[PDB]
Every structure is written in C-alpha cells, then in structure tokens.
C-alpha cells in the first residue's frame, strides 16, 4: 500500500515544518535525525537498539561500503538492509565528500579516480557509478553524486565545483531514471552547492529545480564556517528550494545547530556526533554535554540525564559509565552511544511536537537558555 | 523464601551429576558455566543479554575490582550487583591468582604486597582483606584466599604453597564467619591445591573438609598442564572432595575440557574463552571453532552455527560478522561474544539434560566425534 515517496507537511511555524515522508519501507517523521551507519553498522549498536531509540531512517556511506565489504558483494548478499539487519529506509550519501576528505585522489568532468585510504587499491566514482553502487546497496534515498570543494572556497573554485556539480546532478537524474527497479522503489535527492555566495546558491537551486528531484540537500556546510555563517547561509539558501519537498542539511550536527536549522526550514539531518562523541566519553544532556570521564562523576548515582527516557538512563549510573569509559570497556561505548542517539531522537520529537503545537519558538528559546547554562 | 545456599543433586550418571544450587538471588542449574565479568562487565554484553543466553551466575575478579573502580567505592555505590545491573548470583574469585600472574609482587604468611599493573600503586591482600573486599562487593559465592604457585611446580614449592593455602583457608573461614551479614547471606568455597601430586591433593582435601565449606574448588589446573594431565589429576582429586557439595574447576575451559571434567564429577566452570575468543574472531560451533575472519566466510549466508538458537544466529550471517570483525567494528565483538556465551550455555543445557536422561556417556562420544571432525 505504501507509496514510493510522499512528503506531507502537517504543521508549520514560521519557516519550520513538521510532517512525514512515506516510503515503501516505512514512514519518516520530520524533522528527522538519521544515525550514521558508515560501514553497514551504526557503531556499537544493534539495529533493533537503533530503532528502539526512535530512529526512522539511518544513513550509509557509499565511499566506505564500496571499499569494504564491496558494493557487488553486498548485492550478492541480498543488499544492505538484509546484510546489516535494518529493514527500514536507508539514505546513502554519494561518496563524493569522502573521496575528497579521505582518499588519495585524478579528477575530471567524467568522474574521479582515487586510491583507497585502507590499502591503496584504485577505484573510480562518477555520477553513473555512484548511482549504480547505491542501487547495488538497495538504498531507499539516493544522493546525486557531486564535486566537493575544500574549505575555505574561493569564489572561482566554489563556482567551478558548483557548475560541474549541477551537470553531474543531471547525469545522476538520468542514471537513476534509466534503472526501472530503482526509479520505481527509491527516491533521488539533489544537492545545492555554492558555498557562502548567495548568487551561486541561487543558480544551484534553479538548476536543481529545473531537473526535478524528490528532495533537496544543502551541501557545503558544516565544513569549518562556524554557526553564525552557516545560519546566514541557510537564511537565504533554504527559501530558494522548492517548498513542498524535503530539505536536508548534510552533516549537521550539534543539538543547537539542529534547532537553528529547523527554524530556517530544514527537515532532515545526519551527524556522527552522537555516536563518535559517545565512544569518546561525551554525553548530551538537556543541560549541555558532559565529559563522563571527569572525576566529578566517579560516585554520581544519577543517570546521564535526569529526564532522558532511554534504557541506559533507566538502568545505569554516571558512576558506572564513568568506570567503563575510563577502563576502555566496550560496554561503555555501547551505553554512551545508545543514550546519545536516544537523546537526539528525543530532541527531534520535542521539535516536531512543538511545531505541531505552534510553540517551537518558545521551545528553541527554552532549549538554548538551559543547554547553554551548562 | 529462598535459602542461603542449598545444593541438590537430581540425577547422576557415573561420576557426573546434575542438579541445582539455590541461593537468595536465584537458582543455579548445574553443571553450570559462569561468564567472566572481570571489571564489573561481561565484556561487550549488557547483563540482560548475558541472562538471555541462559547464564544463571557470573564471575567477578576481585583483583581487578579492587584496583578499579575500588572495593569501597563499589560498596558506596551500593554493591556490585546494583553497580553493573546484574541481580542474580555473583561468584567472586579471591584475587590471589591475578596477584601472581598480573601484579608486581612482598609475599609472607600474613599476606601479599604488590604494585598495581595499571599504575604502580601499592596494594595489599590477605585472607582477611580478600574476604572483606568480597563482602564490600556484595558477592554471593566467596572464594577463600589462597597462594598460587607458578607452573610448572616442583614438589617442595607445590607443598609449600598448598600448606600455606590450607592455613589461609582456615583464616578465610574465620573472617567470613565473623561478619554476620556475609555469613547469613553468602556462601564460602574452599580451594584444593597440590598440583599434580596425589598425596598433596589428598592432604589438601582433608584440611578443607575438616574446616568445612559450602563448596570445593579444584585449584592449580588450566595453567599449562595439558588436557591429559588435567584429566589424570581430576580422576583422583574430585573423589577426595565431599560428594554432597558442589565441585568447581576454576578457569576451565574449552568445550571438550568441560565435557571431560563433568565426566569426572565437576559441577561449575568459568572461562574467558567464549568472550575473549569472540572478540578475537573465533566462534564455537558444534563442528568445532571457526575463525570468522577467514576468507571462506566472506559470502557465507549461513549463521555462525546451523543449530544454535541464539539471537545472533537468528538474525545475522557469517558474511556480515566476517565483515565487522575484519573492520574492527564494536558490533562484531558484541555479536561474536553473545553467540559464544550462548553456545556455552547450550552445551551446559545439553550436558544437564543428557545426565538427567542417563545418556551423557553417549552425548560425550557424539559431541567429540562431531566437534573434532572439524
Ligand atoms: Zn539516556
Ligand atoms: Zn548463535
């Protein structure tokens, strides 16, 4: 009964929206946070635990999966969902960002050649090959393959990368639409580029809306610009995107970045922060992050957060988790990660509820006042 | 309603027994395997997962817990059960073995002085202090503090360590019995020493039965002697212990060691093998252990073991777990460990059932024929 892709906005407050994305493998509540499942695992969590925290969708990294265990191998093993045991929607990034940030790079208009950061094996990516890999994975939301430009970006380099990206967005569209099984069961998002420059962002938006996509991502942020500049860029960039389609801010971010981005019209988020910070001993709380290794928690019997409903905060103390993290114990990573992901989902839930009730502006004020009292 | 400690033998076949140990925090089915929970965690598993595999009791290491997080700290945090979230029985070793094998050692008749292997801090252990620490932990089965003699052991050194151990067993008895809350709610096991020498084992047994204990451990094995010599030592040592009390072989071991020890009258086991081997990529199966990193599993969609009822074998393939282990992913350690512990508990269940039905001899033959076909 479920549709391929249907975004519906149930309530709005200013630029903020709340609603649902209906897909064949499930419903995504927006604004949505996607836990990151890099190499076919949300690190230190079983998929059932990921779901129990409230996640409706997770993200997979195309660049990592193509290096290990391999895209064709995953297809032969019945696709990513079956492989890793997550049966709800999966969004896959294009891999273009990690090629720039992780691999040993030839770049051209056809695509990119690079050496694996793991073993120096040679690989290739292009609009067509990236769409094909995401198809071999079985991805539900496919990202167009673009060209990332490092930070900071000179206007010429930002416009160079943006224009080639828009040509690649058209090739991504066509590659997606050529493959019937993919085009009937998955969705395709386009990526706005153009750095901090308003004119380039607008040309990017026009090109993408001319091609037509199921959703639109804001690319090229959370790469060093700081929150003030990111918000300033969001202020004029998001209204350029089609209003009736989801808006996806890639790689963001800290809780306060998420709230501010929702205030500016963003519907979807992903970040390694809750998982990676958790393994490193940082727990998010409504009173700000805490460093659980600090000596002040060594005999603290309170849970990580006094209001959190997650199973970790129901069962174990700060003192216990302090001990596990300082001891290097795997269970420390597990509990910290589950709490952090549950905290992110509770944030998204409070965001959605406050928009639905027309008190999101008050929620954002209240959130910041307490989170930054620390 | 539950008693402090009541061992009841429901069925026997040759020297093998099956039955139950009833304690205030739960019933222990014997023969029993205890997962090892070193520093207040069975590594990579939540306690609920430990219980879901079938474990009735776990082991804690007194030497590690006294170094981190500290015995008094655990008492202040309401004891080990509450600290780590395991509410069923816990057996604590005495710490004497790790003092010899891990610490930087002065040894005397009063006790032992050593430096922590973690930071060089100075600590002390004695019969009285070991019983007190196990009390501060809240341990359900307390081990007498003994003196371990390295392997191999000359007769003089084996008899030296054994005789002092028996004097320490009397001091452990008295220290335990002096502390009313401990003596009314916990149990105390004595440890037979005496290496491979029949006469020393017999003198040890006589001394321990003269003092009186709730259970009797066979110490000084699984330290390099090989299975043939261990079995030969068990052949004459176990019948020296009181028949109507549990028999605990410390630190054993591989599945085939467990079966052979049950054939010789052992009721209780502990080993780091299922947990530590799991993290290292070795999975136990009814057809012998497999090294999941081997390339032959890279596209194998079968579960780790074709008969195993554990949740890992219900949900994930060898190929997936192969990928996680080779990638260094925490979830690889989690899944391997859960399967290995579940496999050990299924072994103990099959042992108990076959003894109950008077076909344990046939089970042991059948087990070995298949496990060592490999
Ligand atoms: Zn929590
Ligand atoms: Zn299994």
């Amino acid at each position: 009964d479920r549709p391929r892709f249907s975004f519906s906005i149930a309530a709005r407050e200013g630029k903020a929206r709340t609603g649902t994305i209906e897909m064949k493998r499930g419903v995504i509540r927006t604004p949505a946070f996607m836990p990151v499942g890099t190499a076919a695992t949300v690190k230190a969590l079983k998929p059932e635990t990921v779901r129990a925290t409230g996640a409706d969708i997770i993200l997979g990294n195309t660049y990592h999966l193509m290096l290990r265990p391999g895209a064709e191998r995953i297809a032969k093993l019945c696709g990513l969902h079956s492989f890793m045991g997550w049966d709800r929607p999966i969004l896959t990034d294009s891999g273009g960002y990690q090629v720039m940030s992780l691999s040993s790079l030839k770049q051209s208009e056809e695509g990119v050649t690079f050496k694996s950061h793991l073993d120096g094996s040679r690989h290739m990516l292009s609009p067509e090959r990236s769409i094909e890999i995401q198809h071999l994975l079985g991805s539900d939301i496919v990202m167009a393959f673009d060209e990332s430009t490092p930070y900071p970006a000179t206007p010429s380099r930002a416009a160079s990368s943006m224009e080639r990206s828009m040509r690649w967005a058209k090739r991504s569209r066509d590659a997606f639409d050529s493959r019937k099984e993919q085009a009937e069961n998955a969705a395709l998002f386009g990526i706005q580029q153009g750095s901090v420059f308003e004119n380039l962002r607008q040309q990017s938006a026009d090109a993408l809306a001319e091609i037509g996509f199921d959703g639109y991502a804001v690319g090229g942020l959370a790469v060093g610009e700081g929150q003030d500049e990111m918000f300033r860029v969001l202020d004029f960039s998001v209204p350029m995107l089609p209003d009736d389609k989801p808006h996806y801010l890639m790689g963001v971010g800290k809780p306060d970045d998420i709230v501010g981005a929702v205030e500016r019209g963003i519907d979807m988020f992903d970040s390694v922060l809750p998982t990676r910070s958790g393994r490193n001993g940082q727990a998010f709380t409504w009173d700000g992050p805490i460093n659980i290794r600090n000596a002040r928690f060594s005999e603290d019997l309170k849970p990580l957060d006094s209001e959190c409903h997650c199973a970790v905060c129901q069962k174990w103390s700060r003192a216990y988790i302090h001990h596990l993290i300082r001891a290097g114990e795997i269970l420390g990573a597990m509990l910290m990660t589950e709490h952090n992901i549950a905290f992110y989902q509770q944030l998204m839930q409070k965001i959605r509820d406050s928009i639905s009730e027309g008190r999101f502006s008050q929620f954002a004020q209240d959130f910041r006042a307490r989170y930054f009292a620390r």
Side-chain angles (χ1 to χ4, degrees), chain A residues 3-23 25-75 77-103 108-109 111-114 116-121 123-148 150-155 158-159 162-179 182-195 197-199 201-202 204-209 211-228 230-231 233-244 246-253 255-308 310-313 316-373:
Chain A
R4 175 191 70 87
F5 189 92
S6 175
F7 177 53
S8 184
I9 294 167
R12 317 182 66 122
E13 177 178 337
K15 293 183 165 187
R17 313 99 73 81
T18 192
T20 55
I21 300 170
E22 285 178 274
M23 303 197 66
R25 288 184 176 270
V27 178
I28 300 155
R29 298 164 289 173
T30 70
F33 181 78
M34 291 176 291
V36 171
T38 320
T41 169
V42 182
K43 291 176 188 285
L45 299 181
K46 292 174 168 179
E48 57 195 89
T49 307
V50 177
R51 172 65 186 166
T53 71
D56 294 326
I57 169 169
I58 68 174
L59 183 144
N61 291 132
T62 290
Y63 166 88
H64 292 291
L65 290 164
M66 74 181 294
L67 300 173
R68 178 172 62 192
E72 280 78 16
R73 171 164 296 167
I74 286 177
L77 299 184
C78 311
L80 181 55
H81 294 83
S82 171
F83 189 55
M84 72 182 285
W86 172 270
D87 68 9
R88 276 170 183 277
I90 297 172
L91 179 150
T92 49
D93 60 18
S94 86
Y97 186 80
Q98 284 76 19
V99 167
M100 175 192 87
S101 80
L102 291 183
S103 78
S108 71
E109 183 73 28
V112 62
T113 288
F114 54 97
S116 167
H117 73 278
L118 295 173
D119 63 2
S121 56
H123 296 262
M124 89 85 159
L125 275 185
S126 67
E128 293 75 24
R129 176 57 176 161
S130 176
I131 299 307
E132 180 183 44
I133 291 165
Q134 299 181 67
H135 165 70
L136 293 169
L137 299 173
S139 149
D140 295 290
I141 302 175
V142 178
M143 298 303 304
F145 186 73
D146 63 354
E147 165 173 296
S148 305
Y151 181 86
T154 72
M162 184 275 297
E163 288 182 10
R164 181 184 264 122
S165 282
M166 299 305 101
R167 290 191 298 272
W168 288 2
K170 175 55 178 163
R171 283 166 60 189
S172 301
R173 179 83 258 172
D174 289 352
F176 183 94
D177 295 335
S178 72
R179 194 173 281 108
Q182 194 176 28
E184 293 174 353
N185 299 277
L188 185 67
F189 280 26
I191 304 171
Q192 189 199 41
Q193 294 289 356
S195 201
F197 314 99
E198 189 163 0
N199 58 299
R201 289 277 168 190
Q202 176 73 73
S204 190
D206 296 339
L208 295 170
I211 295 164
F213 290 92
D214 296 313
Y216 300 86
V218 176
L221 298 179
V223 296
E225 70 281 353
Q227 188 196 84
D228 284 0
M230 180 177 69
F231 285 178
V233 173
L234 289 174
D235 285 338
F236 62 70
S237 300
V238 185
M240 299 166 174
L241 308 173
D243 180 77
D244 64 343
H247 308 150
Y248 168 29
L249 183 51
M250 306 177 76
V252 168
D256 41 314
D257 287 357
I258 283 178
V259 170
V262 168
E263 294 184 285
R264 294 162 171 81
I266 295 299
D267 310 301
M268 291 164 65
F269 301 92
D270 74 281
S271 176
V272 298
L273 273 175
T275 39
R276 178 190 284 173
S277 289
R279 303 196 304 276
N280 195 41
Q282 176 177 58
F284 292 92
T285 86
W286 297 109
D287 300 296
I290 60 180
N291 297 319
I292 198 61
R293 305 178 61 109
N294 189 287
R296 78 191 209 82
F297 302 113
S298 67
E299 305 187 339
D300 189 342
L301 287 175
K302 300 189 300 298
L304 294 170
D305 177 280
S306 58
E307 292 172 24
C308 181
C310 88
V312 181
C313 289
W316 293 281
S317 65
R318 290 162 164 195
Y320 183 59
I321 300 177
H322 168 93
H323 158 68
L324 299 173
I325 291 293
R326 286 174 72 119
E329 285 286 349
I330 283 160
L331 183 59
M334 293 163 55
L335 297 184
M336 287 289 296
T337 299
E338 177 174 357
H339 162 81
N340 277 353
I341 290 287
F343 179 86
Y344 268 62
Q345 298 300 333
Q346 284 167 97
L347 176 64
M348 304 321 296
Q349 184 62 51
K350 285 169 153 40
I351 287 173
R352 296 192 294 262
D353 289 335
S354 71
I355 297 162
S356 301
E357 302 180 357
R359 50 180 188 78
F360 174 57
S361 173
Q362 189 62 41
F363 168 76
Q365 287 192 252
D366 289 349
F367 167 78
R368 296 188 187 110
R370 183 179 172 184
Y371 193 84
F372 293 113

